[PDB]
Amino acid sequence: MREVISIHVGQGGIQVGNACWELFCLEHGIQPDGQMPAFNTFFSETGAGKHVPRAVFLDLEPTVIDEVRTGTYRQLFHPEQLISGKEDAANNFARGHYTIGKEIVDLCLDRIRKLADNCTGLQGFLVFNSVGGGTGSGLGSLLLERLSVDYGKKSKLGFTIYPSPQVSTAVVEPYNSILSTHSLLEHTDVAVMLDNEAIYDICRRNLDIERPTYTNLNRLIAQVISSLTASLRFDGALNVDITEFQTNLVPYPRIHFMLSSYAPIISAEKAYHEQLSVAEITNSAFEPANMMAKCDPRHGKYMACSMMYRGDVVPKDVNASIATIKTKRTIQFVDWCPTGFKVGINYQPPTVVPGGDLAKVMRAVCMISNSTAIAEVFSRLDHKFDLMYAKRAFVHWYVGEGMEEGEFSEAREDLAALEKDYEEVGIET
Amino acid sequence: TQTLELNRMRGMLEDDFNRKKASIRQAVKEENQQLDKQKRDLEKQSNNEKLNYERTEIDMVKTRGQKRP
Ligand SMILES: Nc1nc2c(ncn2[C@@H]2O[C@H](COP(=O)(O)OP(=O)(O)OP(=O)(O)O)[C@@H](O)[C@H]2O)c(=O)[nH]1
Numbered sequence A: 001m002r003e004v005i006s007i008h009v010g011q012g013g014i015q016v017g018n019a020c021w022e023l024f025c026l027e028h029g030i031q032p033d034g035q036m037p038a039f040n041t042f043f044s045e046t047g048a049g050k051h052v053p054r055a056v057f058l059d060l061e062p063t064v065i066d067e068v069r070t071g072t073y074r075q076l077f078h079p080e081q082l083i084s085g086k087e088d089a090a091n092n093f094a095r096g097h098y099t100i101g102k103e104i105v106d107l108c109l110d111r112i113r114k115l116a117d118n119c120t121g122l123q124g125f126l127v128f129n130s131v132g133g134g135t136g137s138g139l140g141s142l143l144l145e146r147l148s149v150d151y152g153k154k155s156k157l158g159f160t161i162y163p164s165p166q167v168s169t170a171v172v173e174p175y176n177s178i179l180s181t182h183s184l185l186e187h188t189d190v191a192v193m194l195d196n197e198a199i200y201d202i203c204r205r206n207l208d209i210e211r212p213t214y215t216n217l218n219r220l221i222a223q224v225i226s227s228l229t230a231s232l233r234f235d236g237a238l239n240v241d242i243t244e245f246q247t248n249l250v251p252y253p254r255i256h257f258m259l260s261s262y263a264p265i266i267s268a269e270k271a272y273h274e275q276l277s278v279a280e281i282t283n284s285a286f287e288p289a290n291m292m293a294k295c296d297p298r299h300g301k302y303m304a305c306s307m308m309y310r311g312d313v314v315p316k317d318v319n320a321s322i323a324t325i326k327t328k329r330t331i332q333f334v335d336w337c338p339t340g341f342k343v344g345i346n347y348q349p350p351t352v353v354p355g356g357d358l359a360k361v362m363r364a365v366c367m368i369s370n371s372t373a374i375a376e377v378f379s380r381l382d383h384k385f386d387l388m389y390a391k392r393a394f395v396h397w398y399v400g401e402g403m404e405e406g407e408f409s410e411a412r413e414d415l416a417a418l419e420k421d422y423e424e425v426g427i428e429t
Numbered sequence B: 001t002q003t004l005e006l007n008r009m010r011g012m013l014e015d016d017f018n019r020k021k022a023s024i025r026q027a028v029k030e031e032n033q034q035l036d037k038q039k040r041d042l043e044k045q046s047n048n049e050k051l052n053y054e055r056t057e058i059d060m061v062k063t064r065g066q067k068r069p
């Protein structure tokens, strides 16, 4: 009687969802056929025999939804939970927010309602949207608003794959990212910024795989999310209910953009020469180098740190390690938060994915840090925006789809008002 | 002792009723699995039959050369 509802809109969302359902099915002893040869949190029994997942898979390019419709899991998902339109998003926000989704949101929301009618202890939503794209931006923000005006009190998380700092995957990515960031400011309670640049770095250095690919990246994202949800799913000496994050990491109502991290992500033979106790594992956890997002926490202040441990963990060493890590001077918190930690324990050791680059280890930590250095990212991203709005580049592909032009201005200005918060909260009393 | 003799009665009767209902549901699942084979096979038969008929039609059409009297 405690479960979630995971949405995977856009293109990256369905990919990370594929990997995440792989991991969930494989730890829960659930075969890819849906038949078993804890699942009330994610899966559901069809009266008898087989399991079915709690999810909805949105996209407008039927490519990926078809690829999963005839892949290895063709016989797992309810064929009404995979909604593929006809035309494509084409990286322009207004295409998936005013014209195409204008009626697809009706069907998707009716399916969400039919799902929630069956849930018994629903806690919150886990959405997935690569904001750099078109449909994950437009349709994603529109669903966010629709759920926030429909249900309300239910929490809304998110795992957004922002545009990288340096490497390029599209040229219009600042526009349809700023628009979704303006439309996501209030309807979402927790935003966990994921970036495909830092994880490429990690897979290059720690996991020793020189030629990575979105497969391994998504394996790692699935591992992070499973280490997050282990609290609800399985046993734990000190459990957290997802509504924990909604009240521990959102000091002020507007600022809720945090970054995640995981440890220990070490290959097999590289970790064979290592003991990996709580001390070293948590000292590596705070390392700015191996953060999932991309920033320099050493150049900013921290505000809140959730830390979920999993595996056979001894609590005395947990408290000792967190004390010594608060001792450090390079890592400092803001004045208005002296109790800058929030920890949890789950007895379930990490599960390895058969054929996964990650190594099997008993103790693992997953950190979610609401910091203030991540602010600069927006600035940098806003930077790009200005160098495009200085000459109204690419705007006609947006004004052609009913989107009022002025919106852009407002967003880019109103998003800039985020600084009015950020650079303020970084100042002591 | 009497109340235990009776509580075991209730327990056995209920843990038989529930297994019986689950068996009914599994039988219905099997019946639907069986019904699926009909639409799995009739469509295959009709597809192969359309293939044969339309191939024969193509042949009969193409089999019109010249007369040359
Ligand atoms: N972690 C992860 N990120 C991905 C993956 N595929 C794409 N991304 C990122 O998502 C962005 C791609 O934009 P899209 O999501 O394809 O654009 P869209 O909104 O779906 O619009 P359409 O293609 O018309 O459906 C890029 O930033 C990618 O880095 C993936 O498989 N895994």
Ligand SMILES: [Mg+2]
Pocket: A010, A011, A089, A133, A134, A135
């Ligand atoms: Mg796309």
